[PDB]
Paper text:
Importin-α is a banana-shaped protein that is constructed from a series of 10 repeating structural motifs called armadillo repeats; it binds both the NLSs of nuclear import cargo proteins and [name] using sites on its inner concave surface. All NLSs bind to the major binding site, spanning armadillo repeats 1–4, and some also have a small additional contribution from the minor site, spanning repeats 6–8. [name], however, binds primarily to the minor site of importin-α, thereby offering an opportunity for selectivity. As the transport and mitotic roles of importin-α employ two different sites on the protein, the [name]–importin-α interaction has potential as an anticancer target, provided selectivity for the minor site over the major site can be achieved.
Fragments 1–10 were individually soaked into unliganded crystals of importin-α. Inspection of the electron density maps only showed clear difference electron density for fragment 1, which was refined to 2.4 Å resolution. Significantly, the co-crystal structure of importin-α with fragment 1 revealed difference density for the compound only in the minor site of importin-α with no significant density peaks in the major site, suggesting that the initial fragment demonstrated considerable site selectivity. Fragment 1 binds in the key minor site ‘hot spot’ positioned such that the pyridine nitrogen atom is within hydrogen bonding or salt-bridge distance (2.8 Å) of the carboxylate group of the defining minor site residue Glu396 (where the crucial arginine of [name] also forms interactions). The aromatic rings of the fragment form a π–π stacking interaction with Trp399, with the pyridine ring overlapping the indole nitrogen ring at a distance of 3.3 Å and an angle of 101°, and the phenyl ring overlaying edges with the indole phenyl ring at a distance of 3.3 Å and an angle of 143°. The π–π stacking interaction between both rings of the fragment and the Trp399 indole results in a twist between the fragment aromatic rings with a torsion angle of 38°. Structural studies showed that, despite its low affinity, fragment 1 bound specifically in the minor site of importin-α at the key residue Glu396.
Residue numbers in the entry: 74 to 498
């Protein structure tokens, strides 16, 4: 404990496997240090090539383990540092070690690959090209997952989620297809961490174009996502909500699967969740669902979710309120006249008008857009007057006319539009 770099270098350069082993172990402990671990000094000393060569000493499993751990400590730092480990030839060496008869050594290799793949798209794809996926999946090829050591199972799930991570580009379609069945199995495993990381992996794969959303949804995971959406553990709910949120940016049939799985019955509690980001992401998800078909809007109505949207619009973090505004504009643009009537009876007008005094230019356009849609529904019933009166009684015109002095063009036109058509002669 507490060796200098000079001494580690000296032991590692000796012609003595045991001396090298003690020095490597000393290096790992130094790199394990919590405050200010001298990763850059270790790299500057030229130790990484030597650590990588110790990975192949199949005759001396303890120096395999120490250098794996030392190297993983470097690889779990910055991108330059991870680059240094990769530049040392570590990826093939680590993939070879997945096959090691020592679980401790196999596990380090899993964690190493996880940190390398997790650093970015190019390294993720490099790990895949070196053929990491097959021996990783082979480590989970048992009849029942419960028979694997918990920490072992957690490390493998974490590493697979990293192979699913990042965009531009997203992972190769072939690799996603190869990984997905094991992922679906992990998503049914009873361990909070395995579930959380499985959820993350799904949320990564669903974060893109509808074809990738489809690859996931064809595998029947949506009912399991909805169940996880109801969990007590925030670290499961958070990625499950993200995945559900991604899926409803897809086609109407993809969205409908989310509704069919019973997802909307969880949203009264999500739209009032004490954690700001859950509530934000729930309202975003709602805005994509109110942008769907009229029968899908009708299910939002039937689950009693409209009062909850009115509530979030009335009081919430501003970014959440911005999402609720979108949910409303999407609802009003695609909704039937009866569905828009119902929205106004729930009390949408007053908190809609109040958000017109926000100095965020975009929410103003969104709200004015929704007001226009509601008037068009009112035009079909001849309640245009009652609507104008109602808007005027909560202070709507004060906010709408003051928006004519607004130094943004798109706002002013649509602002003046309204004052003219529904508040004149
Ligand atoms: C014309 N499409 C409108 C639409 C559909 C679906 C979602 C959103 C959205 C835009 C910005 C923030 N949140 C949600 C907007």
């Amino acid at each position: 404990v507490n060796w200098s770099v000079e001494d580690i270098v000296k032991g590692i350069n000796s012609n003595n496997l045991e001396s090298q082993l003690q020095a490597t172990q000393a290096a790992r402990k130094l790199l394990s240090r919590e405050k200010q671990p001298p990763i850059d000094n270790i790299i500057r000393a030229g130790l990484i090539p030597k650590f990588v060569s110790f990975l192949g000493k199949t005759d001396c499993s303890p120096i395999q383990f120490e250098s794996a751990w030392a190297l993983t400590n470097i690889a779990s730092g910055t991108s330059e540092q991870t680059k240094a480990v990769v530049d040392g030839g570590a990826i093939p060496a680590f993939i070879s070690l997945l096959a090691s008869p020592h679980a401790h050594i196999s596990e380090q290799a899993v964690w190493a690959l996880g940190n390398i793949a997790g650093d970015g798209s190019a390294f993720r794809d490099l790990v895949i090209k070196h053929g990491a996926i097959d021996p990783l999946l082979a480590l989970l090829a048992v009849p029942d997952l419960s028979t694997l050591a918990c920490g072992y199972l957690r490390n493998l799930t974490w590493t697979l989620s990293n192979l699913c991570r990042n965009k531009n580009p997203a992972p190769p379609l072939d690799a996603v297809e190869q990984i997905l069945p094991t992922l679906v199995r992990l998503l049914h495993h009873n361990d909070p961490e395995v579930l959380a990381d499985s959820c993350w992996a799904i949320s990564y794969l669903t974060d893109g174009p509808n074809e990738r959303i489809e690859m996931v949804v064809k595998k029947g995971v949506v009912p399991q996502l909805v169940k996880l959406l109801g969990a007590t553990e925030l670290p499961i709910v958070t990625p499950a909500l993200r995945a559900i949120g991604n899926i409803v940016t897809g086609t109407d049939e993809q969205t409908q699967k989310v509704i069919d799985a019973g997802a909307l019955a969880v949203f009264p509690s999500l739209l009032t969740n004490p954690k700001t980001n859950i509530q934000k992401e729930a309202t975003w998800t709602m805005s994509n669902i109110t942008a769907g078909r009229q029968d899908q809007i009708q299910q939002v109505v039937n689950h009693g979710l409209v009062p909850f949207l009115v509530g979030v619009l009335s009081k919430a973090d501003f970014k959440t309120q911005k999402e609720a505004a979108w949910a409303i504009t999407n609802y009003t643009s695609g909704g039937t006249v009866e569905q828009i009537v119902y929205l106004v009876h729930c009390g949408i007008i007053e908190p809609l008008m109040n958000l017109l005094s926000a100095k965020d230019t975009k929410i103003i356009q969104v709200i004015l857009d929704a007001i226009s849609n509601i008037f068009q529904a009112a035009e079909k019933l001849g309640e245009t007057e009652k609507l104008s009166i109602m808007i005027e009684e909560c202070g709507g015109l004060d906010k709408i006319e003051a928006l004519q002095r607004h130094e943004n063009e798109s706002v002013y036109k649509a602002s003046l539009n309204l004052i003219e058509k529904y508040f004149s002669v």
